[PDB]
Structure 1
Amino acid sequence: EYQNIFSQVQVRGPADLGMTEDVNLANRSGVGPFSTLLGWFGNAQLGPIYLGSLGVLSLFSGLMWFFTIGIWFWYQAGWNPAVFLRDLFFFSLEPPAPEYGLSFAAPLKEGGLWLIASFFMFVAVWSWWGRTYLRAQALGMGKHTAWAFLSAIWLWMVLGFIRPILMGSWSEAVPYGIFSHLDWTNNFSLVHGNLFYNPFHGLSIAFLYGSALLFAMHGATILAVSRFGGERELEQIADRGTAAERAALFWRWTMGFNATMEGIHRWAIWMAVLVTLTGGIGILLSGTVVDNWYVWGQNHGMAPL
């Protein structure tokens, strides 16, 4: 009856400071507080966190981006806290108007502040990517996390930087707001025909659904064989046990083919990086190569003529 969804007994010991392969220990912090609420589901320990040069750069730039958008929101509210709380989700930093092109001459109120915020965000995201790479390198691990993050960065860059340049206007980029970027998404679909008929849009959706499918399958499989210590997968790779064999045989008897305790993670990483990669390509093609995706589908055997 115990399904291993929530731990039924919780234990605590001395905090684990972590490994010291060649990490600069002077850049680590102390351990934070233990949380029982998190310990019901996963680990209770918080921290320590590594902060280095790239951590400082990313924190400064991200804080400046956040503060720039926030101060613009406070300006749009008229400095009234009540209006700020009421119209939160309705404020937005907009990119420069279409008649300014790619130039940097747009006024502060009409898109210059958007350029300042975008520069800060650019620095923050790229320094965080470098930080993931260097944190992997310090521990002697492979850089798989950096490359998956690079896929995510590819889609982000296409949305905010690459496509506006190819289209020749900053007005193509996404505004900084909660409801406003949803409106941007809907208007992007409406302007370019019907984004459903973008084939790379369909592939991106296929891989997002596939991530949900594969992650549910894998979480369920590991929880099902956790009675044999299947969660300790790094050891099941080195010394195969009955947990790995039972999981492989379940999926083999079900659908005719299986994975290993490492190949399944290869499937996982590719299933996610593919949604973001195909999405980036599909957005890049919209407006620069195809202006009306539904008509394109009609000409390519996807929609009735």
Structure 2
Amino acid sequence: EYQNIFSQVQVRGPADLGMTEDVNLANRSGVGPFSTLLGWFGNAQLGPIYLGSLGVLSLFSGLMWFFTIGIWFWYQAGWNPAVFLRDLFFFSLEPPAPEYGLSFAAPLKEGGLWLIASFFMFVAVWSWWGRTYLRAQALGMGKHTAWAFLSAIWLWMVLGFIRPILMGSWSEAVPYGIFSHLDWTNNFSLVHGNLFYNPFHGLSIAFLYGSALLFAMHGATILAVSRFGGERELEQIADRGTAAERAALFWRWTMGFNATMEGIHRWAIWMAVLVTLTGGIGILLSGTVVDNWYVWGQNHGMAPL
């Protein structure tokens, strides 16, 4: 039977330029091509994309961050394209050594370039957050996306900015590079005893598994009641149809309680936000307040001895 995973027929017509209120259509670019490959799964139309002041600022800063790391990777390769391809994943833009602490007196080849790239990334991410808030405000919507992004930004800042300040060294931050930051996380674990015994690390993992569980449940429910037009969730909130009722009754008869067509989204946004929220708190505590999480667990009834 048809399981609604992929569309079995595509139709296309005039491109939808979008709504127009309190929005400067000059900044909105032109509508891009129609992609049939994506049309199989979701909407085939690409664009138009709003390019405002903050959009330009974010694009410039992100381009400079990416290009700075790229140039350092080239220098680290001897400017050899073959080596650049052979060691693309193994390159690193390490932070300044612990000798300099938090000082900006690191040489450009051993710490200065990292500070420049970090400044570019900081500007890019904050400008993008401002862009998200302003885009929501232009259409008159709520700012929920801004606050979820704010949670993600909080974890990012704690990892890169606030925790090095509290520890007193730039060497505590994360090096730019694939295997470099994987090794950074592994060493962060090994230094502070098992990060597993960090209670807030456990809560963060709980909410990540919960995010996966809840999105699987919600996607399966909506695909199962899409034969009643349940995917039009805003309409269901406005005028409760039989799709919402069937979904609610399935979950009520399964586990004794249910959500509504709107509140399940409150559950979703909170189960996603708490991941980064609790992760930021746990990382902030590590090193600053606890130096050995296994011994802390032993003293707090978590570990056997």
Report TM bin, short chain.
over 0.9
Q: Per-residue displacement from partner, 1:47-101 (whole Å, max 9, x unpaired)?
A: 0000000000000000000000000000000000000000000000000000101
Asked if 1:78 is matched to 2:78, the reply is yes
Structure 2: runs of 5+ lacking an equivalent: none
What residue is the counterpart of 1:135 in the other structure?
Answer: 135
Fraction of identical pairs, as percent: 100
Cα shift at 1:142: 0.2
Cα shift at 1:21: 1.2
Structure 1: runs of 5+ lacking an equivalent: none
Query: Over the residues paired in the alignment, what is the CA RMSD in angstroms?
Result: 0.3
Once residues 292 and 241 of structure 2 are traced to their aligned partners in structure 1, the CA distance between those partners, rounded to angstroms, is 54
Q: Secondary structure at the match of 1:25?
A: coil
TM-score normalised by length of structure 2: 1.00
Once residues 25 and 179 of structure 2 are traced to their aligned partners in structure 1, the CA distance between those partners, rounded to angstroms, is 43
Once residues 304 and 109 of structure 1 are traced to their aligned partners in structure 2, the CA distance between those partners, rounded to angstroms, is 47
Asked if 1:101 is matched to 2:101, the reply is yes
Pairs within 5 Å for 1:1-305: 1-305=1-305
Q: Secondary structure at the match of 2:26?
A: helix
Cα shift at 1:156: 0.2
Q: Per-residue displacement from partner, 1:198-219 (whole Å, max 9, x unpaired)?
A: 0000000000000000000000
- Structure 1 outlier segments of 4+, above 2 Å: none
Q: Secondary structure at the match of 1:41?
A: coil
Once residues 165 and 129 of structure 2 are traced to their aligned partners in structure 1, the CA distance between those partners, rounded to angstroms, is 23
Once residues 41 and 165 of structure 1 are traced to their aligned partners in structure 2, the CA distance between those partners, rounded to angstroms, is 45
Query: How many aligned residue pairs are there?
Result: 305
Cα shift at 1:38: 0.2
Once residues 220 and 10 of structure 2 are traced to their aligned partners in structure 1, the CA distance between those partners, rounded to angstroms, is 22
Q: Per-residue displacement from partner, 1:255-291 (whole Å, max 9, x unpaired)?
A: 0000001100000000000001000000000000000
Q: Secondary structure at the match of 2:166?
A: helix
Q: Per-residue displacement from partner, 1:177-215 (whole Å, max 9, x unpaired)?
A: 000000000000000000000000000000000000000
Once residues 108 and 260 of structure 2 are traced to their aligned partners in structure 1, the CA distance between those partners, rounded to angstroms, is 56
Once residues 69 and 11 of structure 1 are traced to their aligned partners in structure 2, the CA distance between those partners, rounded to angstroms, is 43
TM-score normalised by length of structure 1: 1.00
Q: Per-residue displacement from partner, 1:113-132 (whole Å, max 9, x unpaired)?
A: 00000000000000000000
Once residues 265 and 109 of structure 2 are traced to their aligned partners in structure 1, the CA distance between those partners, rounded to angstroms, is 47
Once residues 126 and 259 of structure 2 are traced to their aligned partners in structure 1, the CA distance between those partners, rounded to angstroms, is 34
Q: Per-residue displacement from partner, 1:12-35 (whole Å, max 9, x unpaired)?
A: 000000000111001010100000
Q: Secondary structure at the match of 1:261?
A: coil
Once residues 177 and 129 of structure 1 are traced to their aligned partners in structure 2, the CA distance between those partners, rounded to angstroms, is 24
Once residues 62 and 243 of structure 1 are traced to their aligned partners in structure 2, the CA distance between those partners, rounded to angstroms, is 43
Q: Per-residue displacement from partner, 1:124-164 (whole Å, max 9, x unpaired)?
A: 00000000000000000000000000000000000000000
Once residues 274 and 67 of structure 1 are traced to their aligned partners in structure 2, the CA distance between those partners, rounded to angstroms, is 33
